[PDB]
């Protein structure tokens, strides 16, 4: 009866050629955990915490220089009310996987200075699982908040498996079981990241080209969750990303797997078109939820240039 949609395109420059970006909202502001690992005679590996200011990315800290890691780690960032918890884990090759996992933890309560200490998850739960980096937040389960590190099986029991920490990332002793009955043999999962919205657990992952899949989980008992596929398939459109605005899903799509244009659907009703022809596509377009009625759609059309679409959506019946 009353629907409002407002979109704003903007451009942010970046002096660092990040291999991968990792956006996060802290105190209503945009940040990025930038991995800089460009191969060269004088190029070193860095992991920068950056902050979007005006039309630029401001480099604040380099977390890698405070660690002992030689190469690219798995980054798991957990954001609370005013806290930031970043873990840089050693990417151990499947064949040469040792029984314990060494991570370098970082804690901050201002978004400026970080305490750092190396941690070791002894006899860790995800030895037989593949990990992928993501930004996340607390999940409340038995009147208790947990950070989650989830892995996936490569290709009979527990394809998805999570490690949890109720002490702000100090110890990863807790084991959260995930029951996905539509698991398949002969297929592989990739880039599995949990999507947490209003204390509901969901997962965004690739299946394989690779196709995005989205599952919705419900808490069964103890630390077990039962998940089922959430169909977002659209004919002549390729599923890209899922987020929630106004207690409803907002879903992004590509025209084909080349991503000349991107479509954003609101509650599977209204849609907006993202055409990357103002300056070259929308590959890797990712949602960044700011609040219940505000969110961002970010992609990098060219090297160092960030197209940030700011989306406002509401129903005022």
């Amino acid at each position: 009866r009353h629907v409002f949609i407002r979109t704003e395109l903007s451009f942010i420059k970046n002096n660092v050629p990040c291999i991968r970006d990792m956006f996060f909202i802290y105190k209503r502001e945009l940040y990025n955990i930038c991995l800089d690992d460009l191969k060269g005679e004088e190029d070193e590996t860095h992991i920068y915490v950056q902050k979007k200011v005006k039309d630029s990315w401001i480099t604040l800290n380099d977390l890698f220089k405070e660690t002992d890691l030689t190469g690219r780690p798995h980054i798991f960032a957990y954001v609370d009310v005013e806290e930031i918890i970043i873990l840089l884990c050693e990417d151990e090759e499947f064949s040469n996987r040792k029984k314990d996992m060494t991570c370098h933890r970082f804690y901050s309560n201002d978004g400026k200075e970080y305490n750092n200490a190396e941690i070791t998850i002894s006899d860790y739960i995800l030895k037989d699982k593949l990990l992928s980096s993501y930004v996340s937040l607390p999940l409340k389960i038995e009147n208790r908040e947990y950070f989650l590190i989830c892995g996936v099986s490569p290709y009979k029991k527990d394809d998805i498996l999570c490690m949890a920490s109720h002490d702000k990332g100090e110890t990863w002793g807790t084991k959260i079981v995930i029951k996905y009955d539509n698991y398949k043999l002969g297929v592989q999962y990739f880039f599995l990241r949990p999507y947490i919205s209003k204390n509901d657990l969901s997962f965004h992952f690739y299946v394989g080209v690779k196709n995005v899949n989205f599952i919705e989980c419900t808490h069964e008992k103890d630390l077990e969750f039962v998940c089922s596929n959430r169909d977002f398939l659209k004919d002549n459109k390729v599923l890209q990303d899922v987020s929630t605005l106004n207690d409803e899903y907002i879903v992004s799509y590509g025209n084909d797997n080349n991503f000349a244009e991107c479509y954003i659907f609101f509650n599977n009703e209204n849609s907006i078109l993202i055409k990357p022809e103002k300056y070259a596509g929308c590959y890797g377009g990712t949602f960044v939820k700011i609040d219940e009625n505000r969110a961002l759609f970010i992609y990098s059309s060219s090297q160092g240039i960030y197209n940030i679409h700011t989306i406002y959506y509401a129903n005022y019946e």
Partner: antibody
Amino acid sequence: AVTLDESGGGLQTPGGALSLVCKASGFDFSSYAMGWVRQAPGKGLEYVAGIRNDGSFTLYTPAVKGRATISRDNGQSTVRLQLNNLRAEDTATYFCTKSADDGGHYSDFSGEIDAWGHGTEVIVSS
Amino acid sequence: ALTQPSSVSANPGETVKITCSGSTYNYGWYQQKSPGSAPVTVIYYNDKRPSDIPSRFSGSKSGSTGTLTITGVQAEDEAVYYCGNSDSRNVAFGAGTTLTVLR
């Protein structure tokens, strides 16, 4: 019985190049980080070059940075050190070393060595 | 830099402590009885002892310091020990600490 047999050293021409080779055995070569450590006459141990278990990461001492290449053949259980444009400062005993880890952390290279080669003298002289 | 004493002296039977500082990461301890003669890892990975090394040898790490401890030091332990570790993303060794056991 871990064994680290070093070769390719001795008298070298100043300005020329060397090719140290360490043939390993008695362990799973592909799992560990390997490296070279040298000891100059009357000086202590200096770490020369290091290489990850899968050869995807290398490191070099500033004294050799620009004129060195550490490579490995996990199939032949070999680690090679090439040292171009040799100086009298590179005259030392060189030792092949096996780390107790993959080389995913800098302390694996010089803080986790669990096997040392007998050493090979290299004299850079005219 | 990685810092360890230049020398440490002990009478046979005593407990010996050599400290190395400058790194918050994993310490290694290498015994060399003669220059050019190959080192022998006494302790690696802070407190791991190779099976063929005597049980008197122990390792420890507190803060940004690693400590080699020889309990009931023997005359044969007289040798120069080098600590090994990373020093701010640089692979490194200390200058050596020459121990003398007064037989």
